[PDB]
Design a protein around this ligand. Structure first.
Ligand SMILES: NC(=S)c1cccc(-c2cn(C3CCN(S(=O)(=O)C(F)(F)F)CC3)c3cc(CNC(=O)C4CNC4)ccc23)c1
Ligand SMILES: C[S@@+](CC[C@H](N)C(=O)[O-])C[C@H]1O[C@@H](n2cnc3c(N)ncnc32)[C@H](O)[C@@H]1O
Ligand SMILES: [Zn+2]
Ligand SMILES: [Zn+2]
Ligand SMILES: [Zn+2]
Length: 221
């Protein structure tokens, strides 16, 4: 059998019975390429960035200086580490400081319909002690119970320091983890499962440690 905590490490999402087409392809924005090519273009006022669409490289006026292609250019931070998080199994911490708003990592897994996921829950997952299912869009989820990347080890917090964002990238929706606030070296990354995770209808104590803790992962106040 498989070893405890085993999972298949994948490089990008695996489309099972659905593909999360966004219906949109970004075209040329109104940005101007900086003449100093060490300076980023397509910053906060990029019209594609403002609709959570990453630029398309054949049409972006900033070319290699575009900083609105973070997911497709795989611009993950390289300082993440899996560690033993007290009373929360494995967690993920950043070894170096992060800043509010920063892109951290793409969340990967198997893209499945809610129908397929419910089938997998009945047949396999119902008695697991750890769960791995992120929301995505209407009728579909990212299932990282079997396949994914190290983002699957990020724990829930009732006072999170990161969030998920859904972006249109090359015609498909993809999910990135972004910092909500500055974080010093050593910080465990967390996000709010109530906002970003699929309701797997499982009942688990929250050990996030905050005074505002809801007591249950994904629970109400
Ligand atoms: N996905 C992962 S990894 C994961 C891992 C562990 C728990 C949950 C998780 C659990 N729940 C509830 C199940 C019933 N419990 S309960 O304690 O049994 C009792 F008794 F009923 F209160 C209360 C908590 C959730 C509720 C929501 C609500 N969000 C949504 O539905 C989306 C937001 N847009 C709509 C989101 C995630 C969860 C998800
Ligand atoms: C997406 S996995 C996170 C990685 C997991 N800790 C592990 O060891 O592989 C979600 C599971 O981690 C545990 N977990 C996540 N956040 C937690 C928290 N705040 N308190 C206690 N357990 C938590 C729960 O068992 C949950 O089903
Ligand atoms: Zn732009
Ligand atoms: Zn651009
Ligand atoms: Zn909590």
């Amino acid at each position: 059998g498989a070893m405890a905590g085993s999972y298949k490490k994948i490089r990008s999402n695996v489309y099972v019975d659905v593909k999360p087409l966004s219906g949109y392809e970004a075209t040329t924005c109104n940005c101007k390429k900086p003449d100093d090519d060490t300076r980023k273009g397509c910053v906060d006022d990029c019209l594609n960035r403002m609709i959570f669409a990453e630029c398309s490289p054949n049409t972006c006026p900033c070319g290699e200086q575009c900083c609105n292609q973070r997911i497709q250019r795989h611009e993950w931070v390289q300082c993440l580490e899996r560690f033993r998080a007290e009373e929360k199994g494995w967690g993920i911490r950043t070894k170096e400081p992060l800043k509010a708003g920063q892109f951290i990592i793409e969340y990967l897994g198997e893209v499945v319909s809610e129908q397929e996921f419910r089938n997998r829950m009945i047949e396999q997952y119902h008695n697991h002690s750890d769960h791995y299912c992120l929301n995505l869009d209407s009728g579909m989820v990212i299932d990282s119970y079997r396949m994914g990347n190290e983002a699957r080890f990020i724990n829930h917090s009732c006072d999170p320091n990161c969030e998920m964002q859904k972006w249109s990238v090359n015609g498909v929706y993809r999910i990135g983890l972004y910092a909500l606030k500055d974080m010093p070296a050593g910080t465990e990354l967390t996000y709010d499962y109530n906002f970003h995770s699929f309701n797997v209808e499982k009942q688990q104590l929250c050990k996030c440690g905050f005074e505002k803790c809801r007591g249950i992962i994904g629970g109400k106040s």
